[PDB]
Amino acid sequence: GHPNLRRIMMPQTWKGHPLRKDYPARATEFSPFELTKAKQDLEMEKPEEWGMKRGTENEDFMFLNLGPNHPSAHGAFRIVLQLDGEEIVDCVPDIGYHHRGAEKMGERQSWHSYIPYTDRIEYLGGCVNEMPYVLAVEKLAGITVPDRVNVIRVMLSELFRINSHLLYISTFIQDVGAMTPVFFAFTDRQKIYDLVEAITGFRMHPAWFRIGGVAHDLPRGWDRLLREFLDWMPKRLASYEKAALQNTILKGRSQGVAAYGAKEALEWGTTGAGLRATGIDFDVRKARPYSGYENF
C-alpha cells in the first residue's frame, strides 16, 4: 500500500539490502566501469518514475535540479523542482548522497570504538551526538555516572549547542544576503573551539565522552576560557540581532515563509525549534530530563 516504495539511501540499480546481517559491510572494489555507467545515468537523467505528474501539460512546467552539489555546509542533496514560472508545483527530493553506513558500522565496531562514529552523525553537534549513545550504553551496562560527570557532559553539550546555533544563524543570515555576521559568528565559534580544544584536544569531533564518564579530567585553566567566552558572547549576539536579525529586508525574506502549525509539526515528526515555534512546549531536557539537567 505504499504510494512510491523506492530506494532512498542507495541508487535504484543496487543489488541487495545493506542492513541485513548477510550483507558484506566493507567497501567493494572500485571499478571505473561502474563510474562510467553511473556517469551515463547522470547524463541521460522521465518525470513519471519519481511519482511526479503533469509532465509539462501547461507548457510552462519548467524542471530544474537544485542539487546535488551545494555551495553550503548542510551537505549534498538533490531536489527536482517543477515550477509554473517561479511557483513550485511539485518537488521530489532525492537523498542518500551522504550515506555512510553508520548503523552497519555500529554492528562492526565495539561499544567503545564506535564513539568517533557517533561524533560524525551530525557534524555540527559533536558531544551532543556523543551524549545519547553513551547514555544508552550506560543503560545497557548498568552504570550510574556521578554528578560531576553529568555536569561536565552538560557543559560540553551546551558549548557545542552554542557553536551549532551560531553556525545556523550565520548560515541563515548569509542565505538572506548579509555576509558579515558569518565572519563574526565564526570568530565566536573560534573562541568556543579554543575552549573545546583545551578541554578535549580537538575542535569539531572531540570523541571525548566515554562509557561511564569522560576521557580525561578538566585541564587546569578551563574556567578562564569559559569566563572569556561568557564575557565575549552576549555583546556579539546583540550586535548580530541589531545588524541583521532586525533588518526589515531580512524580515520580509523570512516572515510568513514556509509556515506550519502544531498539527503539521505533529504529523511530520518535526522536533526542536520547528516544533516549539508552533506553541508545543516539548523539550527533552524538561519533559524527560537526562544527565542531570534538573539541576540547571
Ligand X SMILES: CCCCCCCCCCCCCCCCCC(=O)OC[C@H](COP(=O)(O)OCCN)OC(=O)CCCCCCCCCCCCCCCCC
Contact residues: ligand X, CB under 6 A: 248-249, 252, 255-256
Among residue numbers 227 through 266, which ones bind another protein (CB under 8 A)?
A: 243-244, 247, 249-250, 252-253
Smaller CB separation from ligand X, 3 or 256 = 256
Helix, strand or coil for residue 58? coil
Give the span between the Cα atoms of 137 and 127, in whole angstroms.
Answer: 15
DSSP 208-250: -EETTEESSPPPTTHHHHHHHHHHHHHHHHHHHIIIIIT-HHH
- Closest distance of CB 99 from ligand X, Å: 36
Give the span between the Cα atoms of 94 and 260, in whole angstroms.
Answer: 23
- Cα of 113 vs its chain's centroid, Å: 22
Locate 170 and state its grid cell: 550565520
Smaller CB separation from ligand X, 259 or 287 = 259
Smaller CB separation from ligand X, 64 or 259 = 259
Q: Does 55 bind another protein (CB under 8 A)?
A: no
Our CA angle for 264, 268, 67, nearest 5°, is 110
Among residue numbers 138 through 177, which ones bind another protein (CB under 8 A)?
A: 173, 176-177
Size of the site for another protein (CB under 8 A): 24
- Residue 255 touches which member of another protein, ligand X, none, C-beta under 5-8 Å by kind: ligand X
Looking at residue 41, its amino acid is D
Q: Does 85 bind another protein (CB under 8 A)?
A: yes
Are 93 and 81 spatial neighbours (Cβ–Cβ below 8 Å)?
no
- Residue 244 touches which member of ligand X, another protein, none, C-beta under 5-8 Å by kind: another protein
Smaller CB separation from ligand X, 249 or 262 = 249
Preceding-residue numbers of gaps in the chain (C–N over 2.5 Å): 45
- Residue 176 touches which member of ligand X, another protein, none, C-beta under 5-8 Å by kind: another protein
- Closest distance of CB 264 from ligand X, Å: 20
Smaller CB separation from another protein, 91 or 262 = 91
Rg (CA), the chain: 23
- Closest distance of CB 250 from ligand X, Å: 9
Smaller CB separation from another protein, 13 or 187 = 187
- Closest distance of CB 46 from another protein, Å: 17
Smaller CB separation from ligand X, 28 or 255 = 255
- Closest distance of CB 180 from another protein, Å: 5
Locate 78 and state its grid cell: 538533490
Q: Are strands 209-210 and 87-94 parallel, antiparallel or unpaired?
A: unpaired
Give the span between the Cα atoms of 220 and 223, in whole angstroms.
Answer: 8
Among 10, 19, 38, 62, binds another protein (CB under 8 A): 62
Which H or E element spans position 47?
none
